[PDB]
Ligand binder design. Structure first.
Ligand SMILES: *[C@@H](C)[C@H]1/C(=C/C2=NC(=C\c3[nH]c(C[C@H]4NC(=O)C(C=C)=C4C)c(C)c3CCC(=O)O)/C(CCC(=O)O)=C2C)NC(=O)[C@@H]1C
Ligand SMILES: *[C@@H](C)[C@H]1/C(=C/C2=NC(=C\c3[nH]c(C[C@H]4NC(=O)C(C=C)=C4C)c(C)c3CCC(=O)O)/C(CCC(=O)O)=C2C)NC(=O)[C@@H]1C
Ligand SMILES: *[C@@H](C)[C@H]1/C(=C/C2=NC(=C\c3[nH]c(C[C@H]4NC(=O)C(C=C)=C4C)c(C)c3CCC(=O)O)/C(CCC(=O)O)=C2C)NC(=O)[C@@H]1C
Ligand SMILES: *[C@@H](C)[C@H]1/C(=C/C2=NC(=C\c3[nH]c(C[C@H]4NC(=O)C(C=C)=C4C)c(C)c3CCC(=O)O)/C(CCC(=O)O)=C2C)NC(=O)[C@@H]1C
Ligand SMILES: *[C@@H](C)[C@H]1/C(=C/C2=NC(=C\c3[nH]c(C[C@H]4NC(=O)C(C=C)=C4C)c(C)c3CCC(=O)O)/C(CCC(=O)O)=C2C)NC(=O)[C@@H]1C
Ligand SMILES: *[C@@H](C)[C@H]1/C(=C/C2=NC(=C\c3[nH]c(C[C@H]4NC(=O)C(C=C)=C4C)c(C)c3CCC(=O)O)/C(CCC(=O)O)=C2C)NC(=O)[C@@H]1C
Ligand SMILES: *[C@H](C)[C@H]1/C(=C/C2=NC(=C\c3[nH]c(C[C@H]4NC(=O)C(C=C)=C4C)c(C)c3CCC(=O)O)/C(CCC(=O)O)=C2C)NC(=O)[C@@H]1C
Ligand SMILES: *[C@H](C)[C@H]1/C(=C/C2=NC(=C\c3[nH]c(C[C@H]4NC(=O)C(C=C)=C4C)c(C)c3CCC(=O)O)/C(CCC(=O)O)=C2C)NC(=O)[C@@H]1C
Ligand SMILES: *[C@H](C)[C@H]1/C(=C/C2=NC(=C\c3[nH]c(C[C@H]4NC(=O)C(C=C)=C4C)c(C)c3CCC(=O)O)/C(CCC(=O)O)=C2C)NC(=O)[C@@H]1C
Ligand SMILES: *[C@H](C)[C@H]1/C(=C/C2=NC(=C\c3[nH]c(C[C@H]4NC(=O)C(C=C)=C4C)c(C)c3CCC(=O)O)/C(CCC(=O)O)=C2C)NC(=O)[C@@H]1C
Ligand SMILES: C=CC1=C(C)[C@@H](Cc2[nH]c(/C=C3N=C(/C=C4\NC(=O)[C@H](C)[C@H]4CC)C(C)=C\3CCC(=O)O)c(CCC(=O)O)c2C)NC1=O
Ligand SMILES: C=CC1=C(C)[C@@H](Cc2[nH]c(/C=C3N=C(/C=C4\NC(=O)[C@H](C)[C@H]4CC)C(C)=C\3CCC(=O)O)c(CCC(=O)O)c2C)NC1=O
Ligand SMILES: C=CC1=C(C)[C@@H](Cc2[nH]c(/C=C3N=C(/C=C4\NC(=O)[C@H](C)[C@H]4CC)C(C)=C\3CCC(=O)O)c(CCC(=O)O)c2C)NC1=O
Ligand SMILES: C=CC1=C(C)[C@@H](Cc2[nH]c(/C=C3N=C(/C=C4\NC(=O)[C@H](C)[C@H]4CC)C(C)=C\3CCC(=O)O)c(CCC(=O)O)c2C)NC1=O
Lengths: 164, 114, 256, 177, 164, 177, 164, 177
């Protein structure tokens, strides 16, 4: 994967040179800003089945076009296919929020995503209108902290522009 | 005389600038054969038609014709008739072309005009 | 006097043409087609660079480095690799005029094999000398159809990876002479290095992953069937059962 | 790659497990003692040339049969290639000094060498003993019992980090034999 | 070409990616330790020739055979050259601690060391005897501050380890 | 490429001194405002689909000419690669924002970009209007005047740092013309 | 650009060989089924402008929700940004039903179409439905015969599955 | 230069063979429509102030991006050279339509005209919309099948003179791009 830590050691095994003060900053660096970031990682999974249902509902007003006969989200049992998928993409980021990496964002989520989503016709902006609900319904006075809850929205964009 | 040289109409383009630069004088074929590097160096493409005109003027026969009998006002008007095709303007543009010969030589005198 | 120096009377100074015989073109045509020579040589050192640095993004398809980029393993020999890396260009510069002519068009042989699928790909490829002299290199450093990333599994295959490489020692000599391509050292600044650099990355040939080195036996196999073995089905029946024959034998334009 | 930062992540990925306060103490056990992690590794890479330089002359003053005619250190390649095989394996342990997992060192070097150490006769008894000459001083540099090079550290303890390094000399020592 | 700033953004050209938030925490951790590396910078530049004169005549006695006639340092001109050529050892780390990584050291002083010390016949024992004198003759709380004793000391024996 | 720590090394190598205290007052101004240098970059790359889209869909309303043939954007490949040409227009500047100079911009791509633009026939009236319409939207995500996008950051001012990217794309505007 | 001629003489040129009777026999099949394939080129020069109101308005009854401000067809002027792109696909298959093959289609027609649409929020599920009215409307007596009935319609089906 | 009778004597000078009764049948069939050659030449220069002027009133009419600011046909310094550019291209084709050989058109006009548009930034898709007009009207002039101008000539076929002037338009077409 791709983290704070293994981007530093990716240079030395290539070039063959041994770790001097090149490899002496970054691992010291995430002691200095992670206290709101480990605060943020439990903050998803403290109310996560509420925020599964808080995000994934509102796009069915803007995209109600599966309920007609002749689409993918046709009957009631596609809702069981729907909100199971809401349990999964936010799991990729709070796993990263203890580290500060973009690794399982790319190791698990979005690698090969444009191939499958035109094969099975996954509607792209129908996802993002439910997904950007969490981008906008946020009060960094009250809900989260503004030190690294903005880093959570500096990583929820990496869902959004790579799903677009 | 135009641009865009062939090899057939180099024989037009050369002697319509021998006749300009020598001032319609008679250049015999023994005097034509003294140009046999620089006339050859034009028909390569080493020399364009702006710089063959300098290479015709930097010969021995141009030095024999218009430098060895010709005094200092007769020198600077036969450069100007042959290289620019005009007469002098005033007194300031003759003595500025006098001291291009005396202080810094004759081959910089002719190539001041080109 | 009252001396003064203005600007130059010959400031372009003939910095555009020193072949000193044209085909008797003009003065205006000879200036701007020499201005096209200082432009259309300087996009040959762009378009081969600007997709091979995109082909260096296949070396990190996630973003971090695997052992594709084993550069110099012992610490001091990273700047020792750079001596014959820049002599790889210098010895390619001093190749013969009989060899420099065929380096154009036998790089153009497989250039229209890789660009038959799009007409926007083939027009750039037949308009540049040094594009497909690096693009054939730049495509095989990514999906690994050299011998640099492939190991012999069979000793059968190690008898056939060692069967055509001496045919790549055949065409690096027209006689008893040796060429400038199959060399091994330049100034005895090494001791044993071209065998040291081989078996350091021949260690890397069998330990990246398993799935790194199994679809490359389905990448390089149909590669040589498309490129070389399309005209003889005896030649692809040594290719499919043994993929240590299709990632080995090369094009003739760049040598050995 | 994966760190110890991600080895605790893929020990929870199968059972759909969301992480809580007892799951981020798998990595806040790291970072608040991670100032010692910067204080541990940079003094065995400073003196890193005399690790193998004592592990060759000390190897033959404890076993003078390795330089025998037909031995694996007699030819002048086979000592100049012998310190290549052990200097970067300190760095493979020093890659696990920074990380905390040993799944990169068996998967960047040690996946295919013990079956090629038989394929040209590199011996298996002093495989782990050639680890075991600098195995004293590299644990003794991070815990500061060293006599010729005693340091000036922010004082304290690295004994839980000294069993971290004692796990990884054998983890590169397992896959060579 | 190898700093804290150009860690990942030279390899992000080999990634097809932007500076993401794996790439921006890692520089802020240098800034809390950037209040100890300028406290060694002009501290070294304020004692720049009194650390020449300490380290200089220490190494001439450790290998006394170079003052013989017919050796390398036979005359008087080449022994201020050995002051001149240990000058840039303690001047390039005066560049290198500013940039945080190993930038000015790995390209300009050390890249190809023994290839021009063997055919020139410069034995590097008489180099580093000047260094290993003042590698450990540098007290921590009185020459400078307390973190500055090992802010300096990453390249203090790495300069010998670049020659080792 | 380099950094702006080493751009002062370019300001010191031809004189060859021991670098003092009085001449890092703009380099300890780099660590004083280095949070603010990095507090600008996240509203660029969060808006990675916003910044590219109005660069091309701003061109079509203000210039409807080139869509019809005989024009520089006719095909879908002339939409799929023209938006991709502005991808690395932004990306090769996106390293230089945190750095502080022209270390990464002109040595790696803009050593003659107009000698690349001639051989395919790239219209430089479109290129100037590309890099000016995104530099006008770059600082508008900094000065907090976007027509939708409103952030929640710290207080202060970056009118000192507004001429960083303004001095970047005018050099990107220099090499394309 | 991709037909019977523009792939069979590259195979002779890659093998370095002259045209023998291999590629002689395989190219004479181009002409007898061209006599009915060009009757669709003789068909819709006179209904190039009225079939786009019966089939280009057939992607709009199910997708009638997309005239909100913010969608693709947000204005009548953004149905005007549909009205040049939706009939290009029938025009780009009009260019290659001249040639017999499909060689003009896979240079500029589909060849890099979906690389823009996820960023310009354009779903191609309603792109298939525009020429899915042409999936049923071709007469077997009247328009052309059923010899060229699938030769009209597999080229319509060529532009389906390249969008998938 | 060369013409259609100068071509055959240098075709046969490579053989050093006298032109007798073999290839004189192609040139005794030159003069049978030798009047029809000249009867088509004055059809070009009759309406030539209209011929260069619907090449700008139709080309900009379906591509108005060339007169955009910064464009190739923007300013009126360029437009007076652009009508100067199109009228010599019509002039050298009529020199080669009359003489029946292309070797006054390629060697005196066209060698160098590829890099007139390389060295200036003049495009290629613009100039082929300004020369596919002229390949369509000059074969519709010489049939007198046009709409407005009606040359009341003698009746009879002239389509050998249609493909004769059509060969120059790809000879000017493949040279410029
Ligand atoms: C490099 C000079 C280091 C350093 C290293 C240390 N080596 C230590 C112990 C040790 N050294 C040897 C090799 C030596 N013993 C011999 O019998 C022979 C010759 C036949 C030699 C060259 C051995 C075998 C050992 C023991 C290792 C083991 O037990 O497996 C050592 C620990 C002892 C101590 O602290 O005094 C250190 C620290 N010493 C330094 O400080 C520099 C930086
Ligand atoms: C066991 C491995 C060690 C040991 C470890 C401890 N280190 C402690 C603190 C500490 N060390 C550093 C320096 C580190 N940061 C850097 O930027 C660089 C390189 C230039 C290094 C080496 C720092 C910044 C700290 C934090 C507080 C301080 O400044 O001293 C420490 C105290 C507890 C803690 O981690 O906070 C311990 C126990 N010390 C030893 O004596 C053995 C050998
Ligand atoms: C004296 C106790 C030493 C010794 C010194 C000599 N050094 C000689 C040349 C030399 N040294 C360096 C390295 C250093 N100077 C720099 O400017 C830089 C960075 C750019 C570095 C790392 C260089 C580059 C040179 C060559 C320049 C020159 O010739 O002055 C030297 C003369 C060469 C010779 O001996 O033939 C001497 C005597 N030599 C000794 O014997 C001990 C170790
Ligand atoms: C002008 C360019 C900007 C602006 C910049 C300022 N930022 C200030 C403080 C600041 N911002 C951050 C967050 C930063 N650190 C990170 O790790 C990440 C994620 C990658 C980001 C975005 C930090 C940590 C700080 C420092 C203190 C704090 O937490 O607030 C700031 C205050 C002055 C100062 O830096 O001391 C300014 C002026 N502000 C603006 O108005 C525009 C948007
Ligand atoms: C509403 C009727 C449709 C829809 C239409 C849109 N298409 C938009 C842009 C567009 N279309 C194409 C494809 C076509 N045009 C070409 O020039 C070529 C190749 C020669 C092809 C195949 C392209 C390339 C583009 C982008 C640039 C352009 O317009 O040419 C478009 C504008 C985007 C917007 O307004 O947001 C619209 C609305 N999209 C839909 O989702 C519905 C079903
Ligand atoms: C001189 C004005 C003659 C004349 C010449 C002819 N022009 C012919 C075709 C043609 N006309 C135009 C311009 C026109 N087409 C447009 O699309 C627009 C506006 C956007 C305009 C003003 C063009 C561009 C072309 C040819 C390119 C093509 O084929 O697409 C032509 C042949 C047809 C005809 O008989 O008109 C001739 C003879 N026509 C005249 O009326 C006067 C006498
Ligand atoms: C000084 C002893 C005299 C005097 C001399 C002046 N001569 C002036 C100009 C001049 N003189 C000549 C003749 C001589 N100089 C040459 O360069 C050549 C060769 C061609 C010769 C035979 C010429 C050609 C000229 C050029 C005309 C000009 O310079 O204007 C002169 C300048 C007058 C002025 O300023 O216009 C002077 C003063 N005159 C004296 O009073 C004493 C007696
Ligand atoms: C197949 C026969 C190839 C070929 C392979 C060789 N490469 C050699 C050295 C070498 N090659 C690269 C480039 C590689 N690294 C990358 O990141 C990418 C792109 C993703 C590529 C293609 C590097 C960095 C090195 C340096 C390692 C070293 O040798 O020190 C090589 C050794 C000879 C040499 O180049 O000096 C071979 C045989 N070489 C070829 O000519 C064909 C096209
Ligand atoms: C000395 C204490 C050891 C010992 C070491 C030897 N290793 C020898 C050769 C060799 N080593 C490797 C692994 C090395 N190459 C790599 O690329 C990497 C990691 C990136 C490593 C660690 C390889 C692959 C080879 C084969 C040669 C090659 O590189 O192509 C060696 C030379 C053997 C010989 O030449 O006969 C020695 C002496 N041997 C011992 O007995 C002790 C245990
Ligand atoms: C999905 C319903 C299947 C399944 C599919 C997978 N196949 C994976 C990798 C893979 N596939 C092939 C065969 C393919 N590659 C070719 O070159 C050719 C033709 C010659 C074909 C048919 C190969 C050779 C490989 C290995 C990859 C490589 O060579 O680089 C694959 C990836 C595994 C992974 O992501 O780790 C999948 C998921 N697997 C399933 O579970 C069901 C049955
Ligand atoms: C893991 C993520 C996570 C969250 C985001 C919150 C989600 C959340 N939002 C609200 C509920 C609310 N939250 C707000 C506050 C705001 N709404 C806005 O649109 C403003 C931007 C912002 C001001 C700071 C308001 C006004 C309501 C009531 C309206 C509503 O959203 O239903 C509530 C009900 C209790 C409350 O009022 O706070 C909860 C649990 N909890 C979580 O566990
Ligand atoms: C696939 C593309 C392709 C071509 C278009 C041709 C063109 C071509 N010809 C030669 C190379 C040559 N071409 C000729 C040909 C001739 N000399 C004469 O005196 C005659 C007029 C004429 C043929 C009878 C000769 C003699 C050489 C060899 C040059 C030499 O060694 O002297 C080369 C260099 C090949 C090399 O050695 O690398 C190339 C590319 N060959 C190709 O491979
Ligand atoms: C940046 C480079 C730099 C230096 C090298 C010193 C240079 C220096 N050394 C000494 C002088 C001294 N400094 C020491 C201190 C020590 N000697 C040791 O071996 C121990 C490691 C250390 C104790 C922590 C001693 C013992 C002397 C007296 C002997 C001598 O002059 O060398 C003095 C006189 C005042 C003082 O004692 O500090 C100075 C300015 N200052 C600097 O600014
Ligand atoms: C490019 C596409 C294209 C077309 C579809 C037609 C468009 C078209 N449709 C109809 C009109 C019609 N055409 C048909 C014929 C048929 N309807 C079907 O469902 C069958 C596939 C087919 C019989 C084999 C019918 C039944 C009508 C009346 C209903 C309607 O409006 O479609 C008419 C009136 C005359 C006629 O019937 O042809 C025309 C010109 N022209 C075109 O150029």
């Amino acid at each position: 994967m791709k983290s704070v830590i293994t981007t530093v050691v990716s240079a030395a095994d290539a070039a063959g040179r041994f770790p001097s003060n090149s490899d002496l900053e970054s691992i010291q660096g995430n002691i200095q800003r992670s206290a709101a970031r480990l605060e943020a990682a439990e903050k998803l999974a403290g109310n996560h089945e509420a925020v599964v249902k808080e995000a994934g509902d509102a796009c069915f007003a803007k995209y109600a076009y599966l309920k007609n006969p002749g689409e993918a989200g046709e009957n009631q049992e596609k809702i069981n296919k729907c909100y199971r998928d809401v349990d999964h993409y936010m799991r990729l980021v709070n796993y990263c929020l203890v580290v500060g990496g973009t690794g399982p964002l790319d190791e698990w989520g979005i690698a090969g995503a444009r191939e499958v989503y035109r094969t099975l016709n996954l509607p792209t902006s129908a996802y993002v209108a439910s997904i950007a609900y969490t981008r906008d319904r946020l009060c960094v006075p009250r809900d989260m902290s503004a030190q690294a809850g903005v880093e959570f929205s500096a990583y929820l964009d990496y869902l959004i522009n790579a799903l677009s | 005389a135009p641009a865009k040289m062939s090899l057939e109409d180099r024989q037009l383009l050369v002697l319509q600038a021998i006749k300009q630069v020598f001032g319609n004088a008679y250049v015999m074929e023994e005097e034509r054969a003294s140009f046999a590097k620089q006339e050859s160096m034009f028909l390569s493409g080493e020399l364009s038609v702006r710089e063959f005109v300098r290479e015709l003027a930097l010969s021995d026969t141009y030095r024999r014709r218009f430098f060895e009998p010709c005094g200092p006002y007769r020198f600077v008007e036969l450069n100007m008739k042959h290289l620019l095709g005009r007469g002098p303007i005033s007194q300031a543009e003759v003595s500025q072309h006098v001291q291009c010969y005396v202080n810094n030589g004759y081959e910089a005198e002719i190539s001041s005009y080109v | 006097t009252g001396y003064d120096s203005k600007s130059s009377p010959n400031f372009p100074n003939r910095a555009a043409t020193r072949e000193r015989r044209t085909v008797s073109f003009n003065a205006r045509v000879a200036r701007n087609k020499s201005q096209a020579k200082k432009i259309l040589e300087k996009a040959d050192e762009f378009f081969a660079r600007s997709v091979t640095m995109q082909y260096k993004a296949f070396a990190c398809p996630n973003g971090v480095y695997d052992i594709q980029c084993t550069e110099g393993t012992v610490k001091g020999a990273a700047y020792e690799k750079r001596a014959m890396a820049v002599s790889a260009a210098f010895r390619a510069k001093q190749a013969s005029p009989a060899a420099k002519a065929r380096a154009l068009f036998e790089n153009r042989r497989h250039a229209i094999i890789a660009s038959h699928e799009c007409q926007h790909e083939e027009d750039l490829f037949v308009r540049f000398p040094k594009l497909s002299a690096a693009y054939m290199m730049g495509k095989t450093e990514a999906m690994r159809t050299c011998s640099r990333y492939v190991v012999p599994d069979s000793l059968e295959e190690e008898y056939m990876a060692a069967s055509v490489d001496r045919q790549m020692k055949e065409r690096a000599c027209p006689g008893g002479v040796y060429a400038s391509s199959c060399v091994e050292g330049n100034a005895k600044g090494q001791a044993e290095q071209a065998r040291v650099a081989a078996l350091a990355t021949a260690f890397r040939s069998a330990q990246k992953s398993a799935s790194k080195t199994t679809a490359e036996r389905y990448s390089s196999a149909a590669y040589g069937r498309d490129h070389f073995a399309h005209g003889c089905s005896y030649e692809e029946s040594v290719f499919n059962t043994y993929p240590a024959t299709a990632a080995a034998m090369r094009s003739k334009s760049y040598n050995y | 790659m994966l760190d110890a930062f991600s080895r605790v992540v893929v020990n929870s990925d199968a059972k759909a497990a969301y992480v809580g306060g007892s799951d981020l103490q798998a990595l806040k056990s790291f970072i608040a003692d991670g100032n010692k992690r910067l204080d541990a590794v940079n003094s065995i890479v400073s003196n890193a040339s005399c690790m193998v330089s004592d592990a060759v002359s000390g190897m033959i003053c404890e076993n003078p049969g390795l330089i025998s005619p037909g031995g694996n250190c007699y030819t002048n390649r086979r000592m100049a290639a012998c310190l290549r095989d052990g200097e970067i394996i300190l760095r493979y342990v020093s890659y696990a000094l920074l990380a905390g997992d040993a799944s990169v060192l068996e998967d960047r070097c040690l996946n295919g060498l013990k079956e090629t150490y038989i394929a040209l006769g590199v011996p298996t008894n002093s495989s782990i003993r050639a680890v075991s000459i600098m195995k004293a001083q590299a644990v003794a540099f991070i815990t500061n019992t060293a006599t010729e090079r005693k340091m000036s550290f922010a004082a304290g303890d690295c004994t839980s980090l000294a069993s971290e390094v004692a796990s990884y000399f054998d983890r590169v020592g397992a896959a060579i034999s």
